[PDB]
Write a structure and sequence with these properties.
The complex is a heterodimer. Chain A is an alpha+beta fold. In chain A, 16% of the residues lie in helices and 32% in strands. Chain A has 3 helices and 7 strands, in the order ααβαββββββ. Chain A has a 4-stranded antiparallel beta sheet. Chain A has a 3-stranded antiparallel beta sheet with strand order 1-4-5, covered by helices on one side. In chain A, a hairpin with an 8-residue loop joins β2 (62-63) and β3. The N and C termini of chain A lie far apart (32 Å). The N and C termini of chain B lie close together (10 Å). Chain B has a single domain (1-175), classed as Jelly Rolls (Sandwich). In chain B, the strands form 2 sheets. In chain B, strands 1, 4, 6, 7, 8 and 10 form a 6-stranded antiparallel beta sheet that branches. Chain B contains 1 helix and 11 strands. In chain B, β6 (97-106) and β7 form a beta hairpin. By secondary structure, chain B is mainly beta. Classes of the chains: A alpha+beta, B mainly beta. The A-B interface holds A 1-2, 10, 33-34 and B 55-56, 157. The complex binds a molecule of 5 linked components (NAG-NAG-BMA-MAN-MAN). A molecule of 5 linked components (NAG-NAG-BMA-MAN-MAN) sits between chains B (36-37, 55, 94, 157-160) and A (31-32, 34). Chain A: Interacts with and forms tight 1:1 complexes with RNH1. Dimerization of two such complexes may occur. Interaction with RNH1 inhibits this protein. Monomer. Chain A: It comes from Bos taurus. Chain A: It is an enzyme of class 4 (lyase). Chain A: One of its GO terms (molecular function) is lyase activity.
């Protein structure tokens, strides 16, 4: 496969940018990271930090995932993020999205060795 | 002076000769030189084709038996001749990719007695060809096989064949 760790990179990391760069950002990132491959992914978040910084969260405040497991970690700082949410009138294969800028703590789930982020759970 | 012990180094015969073929992404694809968006192969005009990887790791190996190929136990043990591995790899000029090479010497129990291994490495993004070479020597007694494995993928997660490019592989024995 692609690992469940490079997945997480593809679907949630955008280190090359600081914050969303226009209102068209969700449209482009959902496309180019292939979250619109056969269906429109309804919801998604990207994180505009270095990969390193996001790796670090794994050894930070341990919290309950929103699905009641164990292995979830809130970040100490708040980060620069972008939420992407389908627009009413998105229809595959013209998937369409709303961009939302934010700056909040993120909650990722880590696993395996090395101990890396594997799902994005929530932002706070 | 000297014979390549690897079947089908350049995909002249598609994937025959290679085993543990892992088709990541849209699998391996044989293409012709210089491929779509990549540099000319400058230094062996007999080489017309490379294998191309896709958007998830593609690998492939050959397990070379030193005896089936003409050597014998006490030769390997007393003379301990040099066993040389070369590989050729590149990337496209319009995407980056990763390469990895792992080559091992096996006893007949198939214990690794010696290894030469790159880890996964970033392929020059100017698209230029890299030769990679190791020579095994004083590896000690009981070498029966040489296992040669390499692989590639892109680092852009594209559809198509934007992964690393491999070709002209060789293993041989020499004085
Ligand atoms: C998931 O995500 C999206 C789904 O849309 C896909 O992204 C596209 O991937 C395709 C190919 O798979 C990309 O195509 C390639 O584009 C190359 C680079 O062009 C960039 O730069 C030029 C400037 O010249 C611009 O035109 C443009 O902005 C591009 O970003 C071209 O070089 C390639 O053409 C060359 O190669 C092909 C050989 O395959 C030849 O046919 C051509 O003659 C030429 O040699 C190629 O066309 C495309 O850019 C991607 N979109 C983006 C921007 O991401 C992924 O493919 C898809 N992946 C998965 C896993 O599904």
């Amino acid at each position: 496969k692609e690992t469940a760790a490079a997945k997480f990179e593809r679907q949630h990391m955008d280190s090359s940018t600081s914050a969303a760069s226009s209102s068209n950002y969700c449209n482009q990132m959902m496309k180019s990271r292939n979250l619109t491959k056969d269906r429109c992914k309804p919801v998604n978040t990207f994180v505009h930090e270095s990969l390193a910084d996001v790796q670090a969260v794994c050894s930070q405040k341990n919290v309950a995932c929103k699905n009641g497991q164990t292995n979830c970690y809130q970040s100490y700082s708040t980060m620069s993020i972008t939420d992407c949410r389908e627009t009413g009138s998105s229809k595959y294969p013209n998937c369409a999205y709303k961009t939302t800028q934010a700056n909040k703590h993120i909650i990722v789930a880590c696993e395996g060795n090395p101990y890396v982020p594997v799902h994005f759970d929530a932002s706070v | 002076r000297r014979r390549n012990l690897l079947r089908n180094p350049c995909g002249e015969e598609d994937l025959e000769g290679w085993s543990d073929v892992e088709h990541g992404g849209d699998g391996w694809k044989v293409e012709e030189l210089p491929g779509d968006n990549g540099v000319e192969f400058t230094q062996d005009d007999s080489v017309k084709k490379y294998f191309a990887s896709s958007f998830e790791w593609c690998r492939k190996a050959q397990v070379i038996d030193l005896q089936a190929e003409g050597y014998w136990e006490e030769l390997l043990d007393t003379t301990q001749p040099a066993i040389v591995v070369k590989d050729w790899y590149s990337g496209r000029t319009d995407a980056g990719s990763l390469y990895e090479l792992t080559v091992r010497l096996l006893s007949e129990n198939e214990d690794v007695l010696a290894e030469f291994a790159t880890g996964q490495v970033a392929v020059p993004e100017d698209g230029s060809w890299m030769e990679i070479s190791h020579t095994f020597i004083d590896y000690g007694p009981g070498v029966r096989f040489v296992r040669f494995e390499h692989g590639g993928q892109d680092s852009v997660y594209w559809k198509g064949w934007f992964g690393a490019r491999v070709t002209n592989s060789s293993v041989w024995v020499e004085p």
